[PDB]
Design a protein around this ligand. Structure first.
Ligand SMILES: Cc1cc2nc3c(=O)[nH]c(=O)nc-3n(C[C@H](O)[C@H](O)[C@H](O)COP(=O)(O)OP(=O)(O)OC[C@H]3O[C@@H](n4cnc5c(N)ncnc54)[C@H](O)[C@@H]3O)c2cc1C
Ligand SMILES: Cc1cc2nc3c(=O)[nH]c(=O)nc-3n(C[C@H](O)[C@H](O)[C@H](O)COP(=O)(O)OP(=O)(O)OC[C@H]3O[C@@H](n4cnc5c(N)ncnc54)[C@H](O)[C@@H]3O)c2cc1C
Ligand SMILES: Cc1cc2nc3c(=O)[nH]c(=O)nc-3n(C[C@H](O)[C@H](O)[C@H](O)COP(=O)(O)OP(=O)(O)OC[C@H]3O[C@@H](n4cnc5c(N)ncnc54)[C@H](O)[C@@H]3O)c2cc1C
Ligand SMILES: C[S@@+](CC[C@H](N)C(=O)[O-])C[C@H]1O[C@@H](n2cnc3c(N)ncnc32)[C@H](O)[C@@H]1O
Ligand SMILES: C[S@@+](CC[C@H](N)C(=O)[O-])C[C@H]1O[C@@H](n2cnc3c(N)ncnc32)[C@H](O)[C@@H]1O
Ligand SMILES: C[S@@+](CC[C@H](N)C(=O)[O-])C[C@H]1O[C@@H](n2cnc3c(N)ncnc32)[C@H](O)[C@@H]1O
Ligand SMILES: C[S@@+](CC[C@H](N)C(=O)[O-])C[C@H]1O[C@@H](n2cnc3c(N)ncnc32)[C@H](O)[C@@H]1O
Ligand SMILES: C[S@@+](CC[C@H](N)C(=O)[O-])C[C@H]1O[C@@H](n2cnc3c(N)ncnc32)[C@H](O)[C@@H]1O
Ligand SMILES: C[S@@+](CC[C@H](N)C(=O)[O-])C[C@H]1O[C@@H](n2cnc3c(N)ncnc32)[C@H](O)[C@@H]1O
Ligand code: NA
Lengths: 552, 555, 557
């Protein structure tokens, strides 16, 4: 009923004590599948489950829906996460009332991320600048009804804090009435155990709950670590390097790595483990088997926004909710102050030339599979077709191919060429006309506020990467599909706006980026003939956005 | 249930002209198939059938499963069921057991059938028990259960039964109806004119009970042809002509077939025959489509099965004709077409005759040899000459265009792929060597087993292995052909059974029988897949210089 | 529950003279012990106690368990509970948390206690929080809960909480009572004349609240003596005399003790003190027996005879249980006075040898003075300690001594008793690997070894219980009072390393003595070795011959 009590019992008995965190899926089908997965995984015997809070809102209704479904109908003990600065007092109160009626008695009280547009920062005027304010609020309005957790950071935090100040701030939050701490994910257990010592020496006595993230896939492992700024031991990276492109092998090794880390934590007397499942069952199950703590695999291996959208695990899962990293100042420092289209284009070309690691829409630095199409990509961007994502055609590379290879060995892998880009409304009609004339191309196109255009008649899923491996069915990690694409549309236009808001209200940069997002089309083109490398670039060869140097 | 008798339901269909139809299902070959079938039966019940039929497995191997399903359908899912039941295949205790189960389930409708007599005849219990013909089962049900069960019997518009003699057939049909059958269900047909003429003949013979036409929707071109040819069932040239342009694309075939069958159904309805009985083959889509076309309406992952090569999780899995039975013709007819083999070489020559297109069917053959065997014909022949008796095969294909005249399938502007595979019988003496050779080549997956022994394989996980797939515009990868443990074991049992049923076409002491029985009791069935689909020949290379000894030895 | 206050229950006892008694239980050390305790509490409630007490674990850790048990007892089993609670050991948040839990459980009676102050008073949060004495907790409960809880406080007839100056003690008792306590519960005693004189003193000081005598039935001779000596508690010479003929047979001891304690109780009842509070030590039998003797009544004897940390860990009664407080007794000053100021390993070794030579009565890890069964192995024990293998506990092999043997005998007569030799000691991490290597070479030895913060090493594959003392008696199953078992050993590990640290903290923050003792506890292994061949006396000492800890005279930096 209260987590602090469950934790106290874990600390006394040393019994198997663990919990699972889930996030709100991006698809309706994902939500239904998640409920099934939550039911199955509850038989592993977690003391409770966490449901994350979507930064801002929109999915507020979904989080509350799911807490109600889990707590009230499925009879799963839930801890609801809740942010404050990204919202207002009415939305906070609404969430608390819903959690109350649902039978939830555990809140993880969080700040969330401050708005970039500080002119429109209601929560701070409302007295919700920090997580401590939410802890205080819950205690004042609901007394002892809710047990309250707070976030702890063994390896520091995004905002500009030395460790001493961070622990002072942690003590403030705990002293407002939080019964436990939940840490951000980590893979350096020595640093974690040192941090625990520091926390106790600061006079913070509440139970500490380590955030454990099992390794489902090499990509999500790295991307989530780098995003959370999270040292991976050289021992681990070394052990994974031989098999990084085979996620079955990665997961097998990671099982042992993470389970060993968990044993070091348990032997240190920290007895409750909090698993970030990423809405997947297998990696968590595997770690629990390794710990001897135990009493449907079709979406085992997600691929960011390119996997099956029916999976609970679908989407780019680097952070707790939508947006760019870094201070407004830092983002102006990395991406400059663009006054026109050409400036944006040059930024993107810098990305393609490996001079910048991250664009606003970039999960990661430019991949090696761009090397042989780099000039064509650069050419598009010069002409103002701002490329967001791409892949080359591949016609049966060996699965150990250093650039193109993935999965187990003695396989062959295939890729349909695709291209995804922003383009001006002036130029879109022509692009449409040209694609429609070539019937072996599938396209999806949409504006921020408009309707989806496509030539796909059925518009079911289209496989654009697949693999043939001994003794196996065809593996299809990369899909282009209507629902996946619309899910991305919303995020992409949002990221553009969050970029715009790194600049001042009247600024050239802001008005430029906002006009772009409100008028430009996001376009995805797939060439279903995977024998052909260049036909997408050929189709787009004459086309240029005019007024590349125009300043608003 | 509720004392509902089909004869009354049919009388009402004939009076009202209301939408009146029923769906036949068969017992699936896999446990997963069974579960999936229950879901499908639930979904399809919303189309509004008056009832559903569940078929009886020839012999009563799957008798427990049929009964399980009738109970599940009638008693738990609340679906009005007619249970099929055979008699000559079984004996009195098994018949009574099935009837008692159908009784307790709340079933009130039986389709009373003979099934196929045993080939041996020395071991024919049912005839000893007085169950030689379906009429005997009709009489039995009436004696033991009175009016509780309404009883259907089989009718044959295009001859069938055991002999097409004609007229004698209608006399025999009248005998069975007069034993106390309330209705007739016909075997499938596609010649509606012949059907309507047959109906006239049936009535003129003084048989007045309601006639229910067996309608088979076209799910796939292959199953359409194979089931028609097996049932000896005239397909109009009109139909064959209209399907030929698109025979290798089953989406297109099914679209055309919707119209063909719906048109046929309209001709039947206009003739005053008002209840349609659909053979679903445990698939929903083709039946749904025909009903949409008639305006009779109020999980497509397995829409396109591929005999024993499709997904074994599908209800529709398996090679689906003649109710699970075995081999088709008279013992005489089978001796006439397959000869009287005295040794291994005789069998080999029979198989080579098959490969050379000189005979259309082997005991293990769904169909005549495909064109995709033409470019590997010599190697197949070579194996059979050396006594590696090939049952099934396919060549490697590395991205043929989907319109390729031999290799192509599915829609256009696609590419299709095949892993080479080989399936064959081999002597126990030679199997150890074959095993040793396969194990040395790690890119080969193999499955091997005897009639009575355990499955050997190098597949560690032994999940499904895709051996035919296709890449089509705007689609996920299509995988019609799978080699999988469950599929293979399902086949093992059937293959060794077919061999024994072949043996029993010959006399008890005969050279042919003792030969075939020794072979089935000792030889291994082996399936080898070359996962490198860039390579055509490595399977044949691996098996070069292996020969079964004593090819001419007569037992 | 039901607003029932103990002061009213006591007033009724005093008016009616009805059978009025209560049972104290403590939080068990084992999960299995907890479950067994619930069963015992259920059974014993049929004896008809007015309520039960649940003790508070000094410091915490088991705070959760105390609260769990109060909830289980009060809320689910329907047993009227009085929850004990300390304050100086804790802080304001933990106190409030405990009170809130007792509140929600339906408890309406608290025994308000100080507990023991930290030895390192630099780290004393509770005193900054305004919780220096029990009176502060009494005041706090009254302020936060008003009349909801009736509050008891501790009384000391024989002068044993911190100081013994009886005048000052009674002044302080009056302060506590006047803060809003409704009753007094005394520490255990066996001198009834002193008790009745004390009551007179209490009343003459102007303290009128009901007094509840703490009665401890005699379960075993060992626990009787150890608890008495530890609480500094005069046992009458009449009692010692009457027990001496049969001290090694606990059945006989318990039979005699039934009469002794029941007679004492009758003297108390005739004096007009009508409610008896029994310290059960989580055992049923001795309390039952006293109640039968008083005519106050209206297998599960498998653990009737515990043996400190050596008995079955599944018993509720398992563990040492000399005090409430999981630490060493006495002022920091007093402890420095008796154990000196050790600067190096040799100093500690000499302290231990002084213990072995009967020159000091108590080491930090010592329940009692050295036993007579050490006499014939004393030189070998001394030899180990000289070499820096600091021995904590030991026993000789015994191969079927008669049960009346003056040194080795125990239990009833015409029996035979057996002991596996065992040795338990602290050893440096430098030397442990060698000891391990040597034990592993001798397969008839079972060992358990562990550090303060490290994992358990052992050669026991199943690692179930190993019997190291047993007895064969006429008409009986084999009696197995002494067991070495994983759970028992880990329970002890934690306590042993804690006692070492509590010793360290008797010295100043920077001091040689403290840094020495802390380094030792944080780095040295606790090792238990059993020689399963009980025909062999000396093979443990042989195995460990020529091992020596280096830097015995080195003084830390
Ligand atoms: C286990 C866990 C779960 C999470 N779940 C979610 C989730 O569901 N949804 C989501 O959007 N995010 C989530 N987050 C992310 C979190 O919202 C971000 O890290 C966010 O930036 C703030 O974290 P916080 O609540 O710890 O903020 P705070 O504890 O307020 O700290 C925020 C910053 O302000 C500083 N600070 C604190 N007090 C003061 C003060 N008095 N004066 C000045 N500066 C101060 C801190 O040092 C720090 O730099 C989660 C994080 C963790 C570790
Ligand atoms: C709608 C339908 C459903 C079927 N369902 C199944 C099923 O679920 N399971 C299964 O195993 N099979 C099934 N069958 C197949 C059937 O069992 C075979 O066709 C079988 O070989 C004949 O069975 P019958 O009941 O039609 O035979 P019968 O009507 O007994 O005819 C059998 C043969 O004996 C002849 N004959 C009949 N009476 C006499 C007589 N008095 N004297 C001499 N000769 C006689 C007939 O002319 C014919 O040649 C079904 C057939 C149909 C049409
Ligand atoms: C019946 C009983 C039950 C107990 N139960 C438990 C239990 O469950 N758990 C546990 O940990 N311990 C328990 N104890 C032990 C108790 O916690 C210790 O004996 C403790 O050291 C003193 O407890 P107290 O409440 O009497 O302290 P207090 O009455 O506060 O006094 C303790 C010492 O401080 C002195 N003192 C008091 N007031 C002042 C003042 N104003 N100025 C100066 N000195 C002062 C006293 O004279 C005495 O020397 C129990 C004791 C008894 C008698
Ligand atoms: C497409 S590969 C990336 C390889 C390379 N960067 C390229 O050129 O595409 C990444 C995807 O493959 C998936 N994957 C890797 N190994 C797999 C395996 N054994 N089975 C299934 N999916 C696998 C991952 O989970 C991820 O979704
Ligand atoms: C996650 S991978 C997609 C590959 C695909 N999922 C697969 O299975 O191979 C992202 C790809 O887009 C490319 N990319 C990233 N940012 C880009 C940009 N701004 N413009 C064009 N291509 C970009 C990367 O170099 C990489 O090839
Ligand atoms: C593998 S192809 C035939 C191979 C080879 N050309 C031959 O005929 O010997 C036949 C299989 O493909 C399936 N099939 C045909 N068209 C299809 C389509 N459009 N979508 C999915 N499966 C299809 C059929 O149902 C059957 O399972
Ligand atoms: C139903 S198809 C199976 C292949 C599958 N439909 C596909 O995806 O191509 C049967 C195949 O086995 C071959 N075959 C049939 N009988 C054979 C035999 N006795 N020996 C060897 N090959 C045989 C046919 O020529 C054909 O290629
Ligand atoms: C708890 S008593 C008795 C243990 C056990 N119940 C028995 O039957 O002997 C512990 C035993 O170890 C001895 N002992 C106590 N402290 C010791 C120490 N520091 N070093 C060695 N032996 C010690 C005692 O003299 C006694 O023989
Ligand atoms: C291990 S023996 C040692 C006694 C004494 N040091 C001696 O040997 O002279 C003491 C323990 O034996 C057990 N004990 C004594 N008498 C017993 C009896 N009659 N039945 C069962 N256990 C008994 C109790 O658990 C007691 O703590
Ligand atoms: Na904990």
């Amino acid at each position: 009923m209260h987590i602090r009590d469950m934790l106290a019992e874990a600390e006394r008995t040393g019994e198997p004590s663990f919990s699972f965190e889930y996030f709100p899926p991006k698809t309706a089908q994902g939500v239904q599948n998640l409920y099934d997965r939550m039911e199955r995984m509850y038989n592993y015997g977690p003391k409770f489950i966490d449901i994350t809070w979507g930064a801002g809102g929109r999915v507020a209704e979904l989080t509350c829906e799911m807490v109600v479904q889990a707590q009230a109908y499925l009879g799963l003990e839930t801890c609801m996460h809740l942010t404050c600065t990204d919202m207002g007092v009415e939305r906070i109160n609404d969430a608390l009332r819903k959690a109350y009626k649902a039978g939830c008695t555990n809140i993880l009280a969080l700040r969330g991320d401050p708005p970039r547009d500080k002119e429109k920062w209601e929560a701070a005027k409302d007295g919700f600048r920090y997580a401590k304010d939410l802890v205080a609020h819950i205690r004042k309005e609901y007394g002892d009804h809710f047990d309250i957790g707070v976030a702890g950071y063994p390896e520091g935090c995004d905002d500009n804090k030395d460790e001493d100040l961070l622990l002072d701030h942690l003590k403030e939050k705990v002293d407002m009435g939080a019964g436990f701490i939940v840490t951000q994910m980590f893979y350096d257990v020595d640093n974690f155990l040192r941090w625990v010592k520091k926390v106790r020496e600061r006079g913070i006595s509440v139970p500490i709950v380590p955030g454990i993230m099992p390794i489902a896939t090499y990509a999500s492992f790295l991307r989530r670590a780098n995003h959370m700024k999270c040292k991976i031991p050289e021992e681990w990276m070394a052990k994974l390097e031989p098999v990084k492109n085979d996620d079955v092998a990665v997961r097998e090794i990671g099982k042992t790595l993470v389970a060993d880390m968990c044993r070091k934590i348990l032997d240190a007397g920290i007895r409750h483990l909090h698993f970030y499942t990423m809405n997947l069952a297998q990696a968590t199950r595997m770690v629990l088997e390794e710990l001897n703590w135990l009493p449907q695999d079709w979406d085992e291996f997600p691929n960011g926004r390119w996997g099956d959208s029916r999976s609970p695990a679908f989407g780019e899962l680097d952070a707790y909710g939508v947006g760019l990293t870094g201070s407004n100042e830092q983002n102006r420092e990395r991406w400059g102050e663009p006054k026109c289209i050409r400036d944006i284009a040059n930024l993107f070309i810098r990305y393609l030339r490996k001079e910048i690691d991250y664009l606003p829409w970039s999960e990661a630095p430019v991949a090696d599979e761009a090397d042989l199409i780099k000039d064509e990509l650069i050419d598009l961007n010069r002409r103002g077709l701002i490329t967001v994502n791409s892949q080359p055609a591949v016609n049966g590379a060996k699965s150990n191919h250093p650039v193109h290879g993935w999965g187990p060995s003695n396989g062959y892998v295939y890729q349909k060429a695709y291209l995804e880009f922003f383009v001006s409304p002036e130029l879109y009609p022509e692009i449409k006309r040209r694609i429609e004339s070539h019937p072996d191309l599938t396209y999806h196109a949409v504006t921020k506020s408009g309707n989806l255009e496509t030539n796909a008649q059925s518009d079911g899923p289209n496989a654009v990467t697949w693999g043939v491996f001994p003794g196996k069915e065809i593996v299809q990690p990369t899909i282009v599909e209507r629902i996946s694409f619309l899910a991305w549309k919303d995020e992409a236009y949002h990221l553009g706006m969050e970029w715009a808001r790194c600049y001042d209200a009247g600024s050239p940069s802001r008005v430029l980026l906002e006009e772009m997002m409100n008028t430009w089309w996001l376009v995805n083109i797939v060439n279903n003939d995977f024998h052909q490398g260049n036909t997408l670039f050929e189709i787009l060869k004459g086309l240029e956005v005019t007024d590349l140097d125009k300043v608003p």
